[PDB]
Amino acid sequence: RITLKESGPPLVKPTQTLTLTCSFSGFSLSDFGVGVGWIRQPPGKALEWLAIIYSDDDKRYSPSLNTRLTITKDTSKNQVVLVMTRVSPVDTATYFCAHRRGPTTLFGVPIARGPVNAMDVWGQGITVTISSTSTKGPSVFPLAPSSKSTSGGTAALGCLVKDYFPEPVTVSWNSGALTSGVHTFPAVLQSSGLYSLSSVVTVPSSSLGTQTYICNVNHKPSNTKVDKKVEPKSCDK
Amino acid sequence: ELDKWAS
Amino acid sequence: ALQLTQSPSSLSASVGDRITITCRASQGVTSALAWYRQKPGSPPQLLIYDASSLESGVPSRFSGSGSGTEFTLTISTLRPEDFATYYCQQLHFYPHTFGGGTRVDVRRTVAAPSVFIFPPSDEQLKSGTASVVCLLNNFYPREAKVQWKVDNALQSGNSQESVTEQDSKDSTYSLSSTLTLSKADYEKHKVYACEVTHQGLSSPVTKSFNRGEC
Numbered sequence: 001r002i003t004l005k006e007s008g009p010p011l012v013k014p015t016q017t018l019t020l021t022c023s024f025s026g027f028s029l030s031d032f033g034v035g036v037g038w039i040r041q042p043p044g045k046a047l048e049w050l051a052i053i054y055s056d057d058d059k060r061y062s063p064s065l066n067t068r069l070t071i072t073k074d075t076s077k078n079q080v081v082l083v084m085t086r087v088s089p090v091d092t093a094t095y096f097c098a099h100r101r102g103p104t105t106l107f108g109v110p111i112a113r114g115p116v117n118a119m120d121v122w123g124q125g126i127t128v129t130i131s132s133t134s135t136k137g138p139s140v141f142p143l144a145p146s147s148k149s150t151s152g153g154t155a156a157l158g159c160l161v162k163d164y165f166p167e168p169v170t171v172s173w174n175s176g177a178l179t180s181g182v183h184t185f186p187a188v189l190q191s192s193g194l195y196s197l198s199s200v201v202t203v204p205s206s207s208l209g210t211q212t213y214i215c216n217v218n219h220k221p222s223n224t225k226v227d228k229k230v231e232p233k234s235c236d237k
Numbered sequence: 238e239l240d241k242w243a244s
Numbered sequence: 245a246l247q248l249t250q251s252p253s254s255l256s257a258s259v260g261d262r263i264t265i266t267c268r269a270s271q272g273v274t275s276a277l278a279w280y281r282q283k284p285g286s287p288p289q290l291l292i293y294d295a296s297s298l299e300s301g302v303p304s305r306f307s308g309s310g311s312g313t314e315f316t317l318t319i320s321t322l323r324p325e326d327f328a329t330y331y332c333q334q335l336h337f338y339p340h341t342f343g344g345g346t347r348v349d350v351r352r353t354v355a356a357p358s359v360f361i362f363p364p365s366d367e368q369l370k371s372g373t374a375s376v377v378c379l380l381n382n383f384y385p386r387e388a389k390v391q392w393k394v395d396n397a398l399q400s401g402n403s404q405e406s407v408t409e410q411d412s413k414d415s416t417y418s419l420s421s422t423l424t425l426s427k428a429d430y431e432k433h434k435v436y437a438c439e440v441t442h443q444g445l446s447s448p449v450t451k452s453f454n455r456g457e458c
Contacts, residue, residue: 033241033242035241037340039342046331046342046343046344046345047288047331047333047342047345048342049333049339049340049341049342052340054241058241060238060241060338060339061339062339063245063339096287096288100335103242113242114275114293114294114297115293115294115297116241116242116335117242117275117276117277117278117293117294117295117335118278118290118292118293118294118299118333118335119278119288119290119333120290120293120299121290122287122288122289123287124286124287125287139368139371141364141365141367141368141375142365142367143362143365143377144362144365146362148360148361148362148451148453149360149361149362149379150360151358151360154358156358156360156379156381158362158377158379160365160368160375160377160422162368162373162375183381183408183418184408185406185407185408185418185419185420186406186407186408187406188404188405188406188422190404190424196404196422197406198377198406198420198422200379200381200418200420202358202381238337238338239336239337239338240276240335240336240337240338240340242335243274243276243336243337
């Protein structure tokens with residue numbers, strides 16, 4: 001019966017102030033000992049505790065972020081707000097708010113603290129990106145098959161989708177007719193602040209001479225679409 | 238520091 | 245802050261198997277330890293609270309034990325939905341802290357990766373940059389190491405790696421490593437190589453090309 005939902009901007013620029021709101025139902029922040037905390041999860045990393053606020057207005061912050069974090073509650077609106085100043089790309093991550101139970105009570109009297117040792121309900125989470133990068137469509141380069149990309153009777157080929165912002169980008173092969181042996185890797189953020197990924201596929205080397213291979217790249221954020229034909233370099237065929 | 242319910 | 249070390253960092257298992265994950269704290273946290281399960285694209289879910297208490301609604305196959313500095317989470321009979329990442333959290337000291345996580349994936353026979361290398365396309369070179377790609381295809385376990393060498397010089401800080409999720413068909417993984425250099429730099433060297441290390445390989449494998457040999 002407890003529900004939490006995070007809201008805020010999906011993209012913020014460095015040095016700006018980020019404001020996240022957790023709206024909940026199923027419990028009151030006026031209930032004895034109850035708490036609401038924030039935890040973040042940067043891309044492909046572990047969970048990181050940020051702060052917590054309790055019904056009695058007591059509050060705690062991760063020491064390393066103490067100066068940039070501020071947490072407040074609004075019992076009347078069933079909301080908890082987390083403010084983070086001077087953000088940087090290091091703060092990019094999915095942010096979660098979560099509920100912490102207060103001690104169990106018997107007719108209003110605290111009897112056991114065991115149930116406080118956990119965050120029992122988490123919200124869906126909100127992904128926040130911090131970047132000053134402007135929207136940009138990608139360039140698509142071929143990863144041509146060759147003797148150095150062929151194992152036995154199997155050949156590997158692909159497309160390099162480089163320098164685009166923001167996420168995401170979709171990739172398919174031969175208008176979707178080719179899916180077997182296809183691997184589209186997660187995008188990586190380059191030092192330039194632009195994203196990049198590659199999509200590869202393994203196919204019979206005996207087909208490189210007759211079968212056509214084309215990767216279809218779509219980047220809606222910039223309304224960019226590209227079809228790139230990939231063939232063996234003249235060094236081979 | 239000790240948790241709120243630690244003491 | 246209090247450090248929590250989970251082990252193993254990665255675990256291979258099959259449905260129906262019994263698995264155990266351990267968490268060790270830098271100092272005593274009494275029984276203030278919780279365990280969570282997290283599936284891709286979703287938030288963490290509470291399994292065990294206060295070291296051994298079973299959260300309501302959680303299947304009896306999950307159990308937790310320990311106190312002080314050593315705790316374990318056990319899943320008596322592994323289920324399909326159990327293939328995910330698990331995390332411990334201590335709430336005895338502020339700031340609360342989490343362990344580094346333990347990923348549990350589908351077990352299968354060891355499979356060495358097929359290593360392929362791709363020199364930059366003339367198209368990209370013309371644009372002004374050069375990207376060299378090293379592909380490690382369909383391997384298992386997930387643990388793999390890739391090193392770039394340009395004319396015997398180890399490259400550091402100019403390559404990025406990406407790994408796919410475990411394939412729902414053959415249970416293998418694939419990885420790409422991309423080395424980016426300027427056009428000017430690329431044309432100043434001859435041999436480009438990526439050395440790969442994997443459990444399925446009896447020794448480090450090297451894949452390379454010589455742009456100086458035409």
